[PDB]
Design a protein around this ligand. Structure first.
Ligand SMILES: *C/C=C1/C(=C/c2[nH]c(/C=C3[NH+]=C(/C=C4\NC(=O)C(C=C)=C4C)C(C)=C\3CCC(=O)O)c(CCC(=O)O)c2C)NC(=O)[C@H]1C
Ligand SMILES: *C/C=C1/C(=C/c2[nH]c(/C=C3[NH+]=C(/C=C4\NC(=O)C(C=C)=C4C)C(C)=C\3CCC(=O)O)c(CCC(=O)O)c2C)NC(=O)[C@H]1C
Lengths: 313, 315
């Protein structure tokens, strides 16, 4: 099963009980964005991140009464149609708001049962993706495909280190390709134990295909209330990219000297084949539109891995 | 019966009839569609060899001036990028794309690929979260039918085409329309089946390697290359990989007779085989700009993946 989260007086996590931390329900988010939850029917704002006032420019109480209808007039009917009752928690809808306080915000919404989860992040506003797609497809074998993928991602993102991280049948991991800035340790060829990514992290990564720690030293921002009014239970946040990272994994990233981290699942035959794993030495908020490019690349790599593995077997 | 290609018309080959379809050399027509321009150049020196006859009007230069310069001089910023992206021996399927600001012609999209020692350069005029939203909707579709319907509707919304269909090949190469989105008033093709020879075996082979093809105006005359043969080889210039390549006059007669002014299909490739086509129709001529066509190319790949996934959920 899972332990209760901390804020419901559950045990603190160790290397004895890695597998039992409820990472999906941390009750908090990373501070480079803001999150609101809301009722599926009424559009009634039920929870907000204590930092919402910053991003939205709204007097705190104003929000926690109001309706999405009021708050987002153009958007609220689109949401209603895009995310019908009963849809999967994996389905997401995005829009760009030109919002008074903040030039442009990206809005990302998904639905978990009766709750809409809304994420707001700063945003903005060429051929590198098309060029990359053809490059991946003409790679002659899996090894070269891995090399092209890591190089392409590094060029698109500027990340200090991009790895392709492949799982063995026992969930042992192996770095099979790597693109990195001069003057970093090489992780190429190295293998790491299964517990470095515990079973409950792997399952959640099979369904929700991208996560990131934008700053490995930033404090999480609580949800208020912490419990969903609807259920008097924790809000599931695993489909939210803003979700606070496990402190265990923040300790791991800090001990390696990483300041910003991101990864993309490569899913083949319904299973987690591996990860595009990215490191930056310093804090780094990759903007939403560039993340989208990596999300596309994730799908394309999933296709090409199967194609390429089929021409060996 | 499968038989080798006839020589093209310009090398004294025969004219093509319903009797001998499968032997038309559709990859070497010696000509392009008039809404863009094409140059060929030597892959090592960058000497310009062939050009479409309309090139002066896209590129704003006399032929003899174009042909008298190397790509190093014509494309000083792109020439080194081309050479890195398209190394000798690379496959003909690999494409490099850039946007140019050309004085006379505005923003041009440049698409380049390499066939042996030849570079092929295509120039076309070029111009929010719809793709991301579509990607997730496709993935959440519960079964093959719902996927097919979401895919057709999405493509129609992105493009404004009068008709978008998902055409699926059977094992005997007969095809069937299994989903479609269509303009009000058009008659339905859903569930209809069409003989295998409607898309002969040499088109289907090409359609497995080069995944998008089109006919922007089914009445437009093709524009010859000049000279027609590659001076490197005194042989035909391979245009399989060029979206500007002229369409088989057999196929254009088949489209005009249907009332279609514009056509475009995207290949859906599963396990190395052509599974089906995203086929689109417009009643009037219609040019879809290169950046919009890129969205369809990306959806072609997504759909190939999702078709595998939906079919595996099915035994
Ligand atoms: C008690 C359990 C421990 C534990 C937990 C844990 N680990 C993750 C997530 C990740 N671990 C990763 C491992 C590596 N990254 C690398 O760069 C290398 C090698 C150089 C390894 C072995 C990765 C890639 C992830 C994914 C997330 C990311 O990209 O940063 C989690 C889940 C984090 C979250 O989503 O909140 C957890 C709980 N780690 C341990 O070392 C043990 C002691
Ligand atoms: C003598 C041979 C004939 C022939 C040749 C032919 N056909 C193609 C390509 C295509 N044919 C297609 C057929 C259909 N389009 C539809 O909408 C339907 C059903 C409602 C069918 C059956 C399609 C979709 C294509 C693909 C290209 C496109 O999407 O427009 C070629 C190759 C064309 C080229 O690439 O230059 C050839 C030679 N068609 C016949 O009917 C016989 C008489």
């Amino acid at each position: 099963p899972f332990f209760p989260p901390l804020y419901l007086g559950g045990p603190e996590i160790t290397t004895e009980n890695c597998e039992r931390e409820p990472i999906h329900i941390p009750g908090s988010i990373q501070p480079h964005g803001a999150l609101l939850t809301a009722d599926g029917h009424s559009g009634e704002v039920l929870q907000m991140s204590l930092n919402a006032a910053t991003f939205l420019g709204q007097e705190p109480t104003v929000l926690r009464g109001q309706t999405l209808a009021a708050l987002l007039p153009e958007q609220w009917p689109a949401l209603q149609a895009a995310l019908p009752p009963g849809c999967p928690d994996a389905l997401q809808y995005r829009a760009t708001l030109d919002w008074p306080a903040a030039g442009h915000l990206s809005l990302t919404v998904h639905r978990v049962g009766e709750l809409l989860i809304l994420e707001f992040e700063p945003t903005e506003a060429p051929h590198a993706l098309r060029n990359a797609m053809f490059a991946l497809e003409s790679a002659p074998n899996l090894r070269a495909l891995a090399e092209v993928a890591t190089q392409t991602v590094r060029e698109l993102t500027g990340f200090d280190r991009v790895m392709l991280y492949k799982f063995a049948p026992d969930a042992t991991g192996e770095v099979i390709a790597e693109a990195r800035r001069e003057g970093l340790h090489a992780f190429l060829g190295h293998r790491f134990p299964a517990s470095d990514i515990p079973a409950q992290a792997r399952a959640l990564y099979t369904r929700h295909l991208l996560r990131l720690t934008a700053d490995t030293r930033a404090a999480a921002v609580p949800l208020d209330p912490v419990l969903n009014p609807q259920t008097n239970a924790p809000t599931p946040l695993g489909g939210a990219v803003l979700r606070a990272t496990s402190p265990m994994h923040m300790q791991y990233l800090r001990n390696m000297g990483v300041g910003s981290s991101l990864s993309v699942s490569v899913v083949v035959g319904g299973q987690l084949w591996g990860l595009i794993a990215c490191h930056h030495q310093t804090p780094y908020v990759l903007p939403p539109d560039l993340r989208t490019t990596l999300e596309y690349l994730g799908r394309l790599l999933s296709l090409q891995v199967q194609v390429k593995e089929a021409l060996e077997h």
